[PDB]
Swiss-Prot record:
Fe(3+) 1 binds at D61, Y93, Y186, H247. Belongs to the transferrin family. It is found in: Secreted. The modification Dimethylated arginine is found at R21. Has a bilobed structure, each lobe binds a single Fe(3+) ion. Does not always bind 2 Fe(3+) ions. Hydrogencarbonate 1 binds at T118, R122, A124, G125. The chain holds residues 22 to 350 of 698 of the full protein. It comes from Homo sapiens. Monomer. Part of a complex composed of SLC40A1/ferroportin, TF/transferrin and HEPH/hephaestin that transfers iron from cells to transferrin. Disulfide bonds join C7-C46, C17-C37, C116-C192, C135-C329, C156-C172, C159-C177, C169-C175, C225-C239. This is Serotransferrin. Changing D275G: In allele TF*D1. Expressed by the liver and secreted in plasma. Glycans are attached at S30.
Length: 329
């Protein structure tokens, strides 16, 4: 079944990718799928490499999955992570806004606060919250990056251009687009909040549970609800900004090895999936969180035949894309 060239973003994912490679070769038959690792500096380098036939797969946030579908890359979603549990696999998660208890501000009072984002262009960390805050932003609202920079009093938006928008990297100079940046991703945006650099962290409902084991510590955090009220972090079901599609593995439309990618990940989850093995874990790592796949993931599900990004994401989500692209207030 040959090799799947997985695109790892930076050293931490590269390390996990190597371990993945070795453990698979230890339990998979000689004629079964194998994993090779291609190291890049950002998810964007991964998209291009795949489009260039230099790599075959990379897992992306749903909003980035849409971007990957755009010319000249034209990539397609092939395997989706799922969450929740084995009994009720959910191919979605919730975008939430975590804040410190007693900080004294609601969703409608975010102007002038310091913000922590998982990364520019990602569902929970950017597009969802910024979409809801769009009209509260000072004009001109486009380019978005500049408007967001002016709205907050400094933030960290990984992957954004610090030269054009320095305010977006005040909390994480350079705005690194990988785990090399301590405030990158879900875990990074949360740390940015926990360590006191920012007042709010736009992440997923699972983020605080994935990063803080003690309930006593979690009781010092809250969530900002749409009706301008706050609720405990465990009440995300009825206090979130939006429900968003799973992070998903993308590949080329033609000659993309979608068949081998599924086989690799399906066999991988049977051997090293959630709580499957003590020797290696697909959804965790001593080198960092959310490497290659989200830690909050419980497994994988195959995307229907030839489905493109638009079909996969669903009507609601694509509408919100058009809505943001065509601002209006
Ligand atoms: Fe995400």
């Amino acid at each position: 079944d040959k090799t799947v060239r997985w695109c790892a973003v930076s050293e931490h994912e590269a390390t996990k990718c190597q371990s993945f490679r070795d453990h698979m070769k230890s339990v998979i038959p000689s004629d079964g799928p194998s994993v090779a690792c291609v190291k890049k500096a950002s998810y964007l380098d991964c998209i291009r490499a795949i489009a260039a036939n230099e790599a075959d797969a990379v897992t992306l946030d749903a909003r980035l999955v849409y971007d990957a579908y755009l010319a000249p890359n034209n990539l397609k979603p092939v395997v989706a992570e799922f969450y929740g549990s084995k009994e009720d696999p959910q191919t979605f998660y919730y975008a939430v806004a975590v804040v410190k208890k007693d900080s004294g501000f609601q969703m409608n009072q975010l102007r002038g606060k310091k913000s922590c984002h998982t990364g520019l262009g990602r569902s929970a960390g950017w597009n969802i919250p910024i979409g809801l805050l769009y009209c509260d932003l000072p004009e001109p609202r486009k380019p978005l990056e500049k408007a967001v920079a002016n709205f907050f009093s400094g933030s960290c938006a990984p992957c954004a251009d610090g030269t054009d928008f320095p305010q977006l990297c005040q909390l994480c100079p350079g705005c690194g687009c990988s785990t090399l940046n301590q405030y990158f991703g879900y875990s990074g945006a949360f740390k940015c909040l926990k360590d006191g650099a920012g007042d709010v962290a736009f992440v997923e409902h699972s983020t605080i549970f994935e990063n803080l084991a003690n309930k006593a510590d979690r009781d010092q955090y809250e969530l900002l609800c749409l009706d301008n009220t706050r609720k405990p972090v465990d009440e995300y079901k009825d206090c979130h900004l939006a429900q968003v599609p799973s992070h998903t593995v993308v590949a080329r439309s033609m000659g993309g090895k979608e068949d081998l990618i599924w086989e690799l990940l399906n066999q991988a989850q049977e051997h090293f999936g959630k709580d499957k093995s003590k020797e290696f874990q697909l959804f965790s790592s001593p080198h960092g969180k959310d490497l290659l796949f989200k830690d909050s993931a419980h497994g994988f599900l195959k995307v229907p035949p030839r489905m493109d990004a638009k079909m996969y994401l669903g009507y609601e989500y694509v509408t919100a894309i058009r809505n943001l692209r065509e601002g209006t207030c």
